Design an enzyme around this catalytic site. Structure first.
Site, PDB file in Angstrom:
ATOM      1  N   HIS A 138       8.213  -4.583  -2.825  1.00 51.28           N
ATOM      2  CA  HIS A 138       7.581  -4.939  -1.646  1.00 51.28           C
ATOM      3  C   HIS A 138       8.645  -5.395  -0.622  1.00 51.28           C
ATOM      4  O   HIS A 138       9.586  -6.056  -1.055  1.00 51.28           O
ATOM      5  CB  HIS A 138       6.616  -6.000  -2.155  1.00 51.28           C
ATOM      6  CG  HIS A 138       5.455  -6.201  -1.278  1.00 51.28           C
ATOM      7  ND1 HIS A 138       5.607  -6.681  -0.015  1.00 51.28           N
ATOM      8  CD2 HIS A 138       4.143  -6.030  -1.497  1.00 51.28           C
ATOM      9  CE1 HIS A 138       4.433  -6.758   0.544  1.00 51.28           C
ATOM     10  NE2 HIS A 138       3.518  -6.363  -0.347  1.00 51.28           N
ATOM     11  N   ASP A 180       0.850  -1.253   0.000  1.00 52.60           N
ATOM     12  CA  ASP A 180       0.000   0.000   0.000  1.00 52.60           C
ATOM     13  C   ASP A 180       0.870   1.283   0.000  1.00 52.60           C
ATOM     14  O   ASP A 180       0.340   2.391   0.172  1.00 52.60           O
ATOM     15  CB  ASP A 180      -0.916   0.008   1.221  1.00 52.60           C
ATOM     16  CG  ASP A 180      -0.160   0.112   2.552  1.00 52.60           C
ATOM     17  OD1 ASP A 180       1.080  -0.038   2.572  1.00 52.60           O
ATOM     18  OD2 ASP A 180      -0.801   0.381   3.568  1.00 52.60           O
ATOM     19  N   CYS A 205       4.729  -0.318   3.280  1.00 57.03           N
ATOM     20  CA  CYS A 205       5.155  -1.608   3.714  1.00 57.03           C
ATOM     21  C   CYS A 205       6.560  -1.638   4.333  1.00 57.03           C
ATOM     22  O   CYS A 205       6.831  -2.526   5.224  1.00 57.03           O
ATOM     23  CB  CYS A 205       4.928  -2.662   2.638  1.00 57.03           C
ATOM     24  SG  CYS A 205       6.209  -2.821   1.380  1.00 57.03           S
TER      25      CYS A 205
HETATM   26  C1  LIG Z   1       6.449  -1.415   0.509  1.00 58.19           C
HETATM   27  C2  LIG Z   1       5.210  -1.083  -0.295  1.00 58.19           C
HETATM   28  O1  LIG Z   1       4.144  -0.713   0.235  1.00 58.19           O
HETATM   29  N1  LIG Z   1       5.286  -1.331  -1.629  1.00 58.19           N
HETATM   30  C3  LIG Z   1       4.152  -1.053  -2.514  1.00 58.19           C
HETATM   31  C4  LIG Z   1       4.365  -1.351  -3.949  1.00 58.19           C
HETATM   32  C5  LIG Z   1       4.306  -2.407  -4.627  1.00 58.19           C
HETATM   33  C6  LIG Z   1       4.359  -2.865  -5.795  1.00 58.19           C
HETATM   34  C7  LIG Z   1       4.628  -1.849  -6.694  1.00 58.19           C
HETATM   35  C8  LIG Z   1       4.826  -0.581  -6.155  1.00 58.19           C
HETATM   36  C9  LIG Z   1       5.306   0.602  -6.911  1.00 58.19           C
HETATM   37  C10 LIG Z   1       4.625  -0.605  -4.906  1.00 58.19           C
END
Ligand SMILES: *CC(=O)/N=C/c1cccc(C)c1
Length: 225
Positions: free
Chosen positions: A219, A43, A46
């Site tokens: 992520h 979101d 993360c």
């Molecule tokens: C860590 C986080 O929340 N990552 C979110 C995310 C995932 C997949 C693609 C993007 C740009 C973001």
């Protein structure tokens, strides 16, 4: 468990990259060094949510380490005030973080900590605290971050746009700053789709880690040694 999952076997994440040669190779290799994983919701929050949960989980049952961490957290309002944040505007976020640290002390269970981090309200209050503390730590050490990261960068604009707001993604600077702000040693494992070695970085370079994270498809997931 919509924000941070139950623990799963490392090889369970093969299903996220079916019939992918490079991801299968790197996940098999990772499974030789780590036994379990927790997934986090993608979101834009993360990194903060994973690091906060994993570090507080690593404190459970450790009475000296809890006492020292509480002493540091009690001083963080002074970091926020020195950087120009106002008490009446950070109060609700500080109080949420101090509450979850007292839960680690008083309750001491994985199940109770995981419930707070899966409560959208408490969990987002904790993330917003960690983003304000990251911003304060960078602002108060602007010459350090210009000398060692990027002489050309605009520090105040970067914190305003890329640290404080919810859902903003991290780079090395936010990871180094929150690590230093809370004295958390962490290791990040990197899994991409290039035909390269599985590799990792430690923050700070010295250290024996408390926390292991997997960075894959933008992520941060939580690893267990
Ligand atoms: C860590 C986080 O929340 N990552 C979110 C995310 C995932 C997949 C693609 C993007 C740009 C973001």
């Amino acid at each position: 468990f919509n924000l941070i999952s139950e623990k799963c076997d490392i090889l369970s994440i093969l299903r996220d990259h079916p019939e992918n040669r490079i991801y299968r190779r790197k996940i098999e290799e990772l499974s030789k060094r780590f036994t379990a994983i927790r997934k986090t919701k993608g979101d834009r929050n993360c990194f903060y949510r994973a690091l906060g949960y994993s570090y507080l989980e690593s404190l459970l049952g450790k009475s000296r380490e809890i006492f020292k961490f509480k002493e540091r957290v009690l001083q963080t309002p002074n970091d926020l005030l020195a950087a120009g944040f106002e008490e009446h505007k950070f109060r609700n976020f500080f109080n949420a973080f101090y509450s979850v640290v007292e839960l680690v002390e008083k309750d001491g269970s994985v199940s109770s900590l995981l419930k707070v981090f899966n409560d959208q309200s408490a969990s987002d209050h904790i993330v917003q605290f960690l983003r304000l503390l990251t911003s304060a730590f960078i602002r108060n050490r602007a010459d350090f971050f210009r000398h060692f990261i990027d002489e050309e960068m605009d520090i105040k604009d970067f914190c305003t746009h890329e640290v404080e707001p919810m859902a903003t993604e991290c780079d090395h600077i936010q990871i180094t700053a929150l690590s230093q702000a809370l004295s958390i040693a962490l290791q990040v494992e990197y899994v991409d789709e290039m035909d390269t070695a599985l590799n990792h970085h430690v923050f700070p370079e010295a250290a024996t880690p408390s926390v292991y994270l997997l960075y894959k498809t933008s992520h941060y997931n939580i690893l267990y040694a």
